[PDB]
């Protein structure tokens, strides 16, 4: 469904049938609520505990097809542009793509073959570095986030006497906002995520109805406006 | 089997990264268990204390084929001068220092007293210290033209007690095997003083038994407190 259909069925589901009908929502408000509902839905469906099914990214066909249009593959750029201080002397710093929402798969291609990057926790890092070896298992590499400015910088730890040729990252692209109409105005240009032009929902049509329902629920919680509704509907932001 | 094949087979036998509960080891851990299994297995095989084989160092063709590649021969003529022995006619010879167990040991004698038998190869007999005093005078088990008594002493030495002058000392022993190192270990780490890759020098027949023993040792190491 295109943006006009988002807005028309938003109006239908919000106030065109309600008995003591409420004021219609302005297009900026509808775009804001739709973008919020989109992000909430993405976060709810990525995490199993966030939805009533207990199903995350790839726990069912529907969850695969939900994020299928939001998956992207890119590469981390070696961060030798400027000097820096790494926590580990034997780690190579890489910069992830700017439009990164969530990392789901990483791999590094070295001279000793491809290796799956395992994101190790800080307590896990301490445990592993208290051991005599201090290097990954055969077909794996280690990873920790380092000092990041304006984009995520990442330290890749591989086994000794190994060089990294490329660093691929299969991630979830940051969703683009849903903007119903050109938000340009003479009184001031308002933006949802830095863009005023019309922006279609760049995800699969399977969850457009879900985004619409969530947006309507958020609109009605805003209309109710007491602390109660804000608190319970803020639980699903996550 | 090569080092890559030790590692891949070791993972396959441990069911690493399979769906069921399992165990995953680093290449240093794999090397540790492979080398420990190697050394345990060959010591047990030499002494014949392995129940599965139940045979000693060269008691059958199987054990010969297993430990053939550790058998090293040594020859020396230099004698260590200043040392205190249990007889006037005692000479000390250094041991190669990579020796594990001495299996053949013989001594060539150069003396004018044994006329026309000069250069006689003489059997070096390891003698305990109980037996030494009553074996100095023994004409059937003591030192002679055809027999030399060897006693182990400090600093990797062999005290050879002989009636005649000892010229050369020949040995054939079991050597320190090269450790099984699957990866170039980082700085500081090493197995038996070796940091680089080290392949097993034994025959491929026993490599799979070494792999099985290493897997069992790994399961023991991870599951000795649970």
UniProtKB/Swiss-Prot annotation, chain A:
The keyword Phosphoprotein does not apply. GO terms for cellular component: virion component. Keywords: Virion. It is found in: Virion. Homododecamer. The barrel is composed of five stacked dodecameric ring structures. Rings 4 and 5 are both composed of gp34. Podoviridae-like phages usually possess only one such ring. The tail is thus rather long. Forms the tail multi-ring barrel with ring protein 1, ring protein 2 and ring protein 3. This is Ring protein 4/5.
Swiss-Prot record, chain B:
GO terms for cellular component: virion component. It comes from the Viruses. Keywords: Virion. It is found in: Virion. Forms the tail multi-ring barrel with ring protein 1, ring protein 2 and ring protein 4. The barrel is composed of five stacked dodecameric ring structures. Podoviridae-like phages usually possess only one such ring. The tail is thus rather long. Homododecamer. This is Ring protein 3.
């Amino acid at each position: 469904m295109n943006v006009n259909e988002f807005s028309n069925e938003f109006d239908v589901l919000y106030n065109n049938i309600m008995s003591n009908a409420a004021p219609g929502l302005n297009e900026y408000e509808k775009s804001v609520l739709l973008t919020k509902a989109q992000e909430e839905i993405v976060k709810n469906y990525f995490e199993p505990a966030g939805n009533k099914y207990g199903k995350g990214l790839d726990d069912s066909p529907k969850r695969q097809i939900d994020f299928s249009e939001l998956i992207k593959v890119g590469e981390g750029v070696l961060n030798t542009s400027a000097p820096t201080i790494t926590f580990d002397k034997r780690a190579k710093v890489y910069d992830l793509p700017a439009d990164l929402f969530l990392v789901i798969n990483e791999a590094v291609d070295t001279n000793a073959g491809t290796k799956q990057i395992v994101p190790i926790s800080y307590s896990d890092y301490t445990r592993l570095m208290s051991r005599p070896y201090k290097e990954p298992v055969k077909y794996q590499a280690w990873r920790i986030i380092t000092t990041s400015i304006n984009n995520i910088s990442v330290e890749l730890i591989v086994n000794s006497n190994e060089t990294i040729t490329d660093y691929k990252v299969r991630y979830i692209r940051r969703p683009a906002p849903i903007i119903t109409t050109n938000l340009s105005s003479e009184y001031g240009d308002v933006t949802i995520n830095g863009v005023s032009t019309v922006s279609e929902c760049e995800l699969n049509p399977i969850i457009h109805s879900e985004i619409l329902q969530r947006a309507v629920e958020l609109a009605k919680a805003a209309y109710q406006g007491d602390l109660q509704a804000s608190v319970e509907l803020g639980q699903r932001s996550e | 089997m090569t080092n890559k094949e030790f590692s891949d087979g070791f993972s396959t036998l441990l069911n690493s990264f399979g769906i069921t509960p399992n165990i995953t080891l680093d290449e240093y851990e794999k090397s540790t268990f492979l080398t420990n299994a190697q050394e345990q297995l060959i010591i047990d095989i030499y002494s014949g204390r392995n129940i599965i084989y139940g045979k000693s160092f060269e008691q059958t063709e199987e054990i010969r084929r297993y430990l053939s590649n550790l058998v090293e021969t040594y020859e020396t003529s230099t004698k260590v001068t200043g040392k205190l022995g249990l007889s006037k006619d005692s000479v000390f010879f250094e041991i190669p220092q990579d020796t594990w167990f001495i299996t053949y040991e013989v001594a060539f004698l150069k003396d004018s007293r044994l006329g026309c038998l000069d250069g006689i190869e003489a059997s070096v007999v390891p003698l305990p210290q109980d037996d030494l005093y009553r074996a100095k005078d023994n004409p059937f088990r003591g030192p002679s033209k055809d027999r030399v008594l060897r006693l182990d002493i400090k600093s990797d030495l062999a005290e050879l007690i002989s009636k005649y002058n000892v010229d050369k000392y020949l040995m054939r022993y079991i050597s320190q095997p090269t450790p099984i190192i699957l990866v170039d270990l980082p700085d500081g780490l090493s197995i038996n003083g070796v940091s680089t890759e080290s392949e097993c020098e034994l025959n491929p027949v026993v490599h799979r038994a070494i792999l099985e023993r290493a897997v069992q040792l790994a399961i023991i190491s991870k599951t000795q407190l649970t």
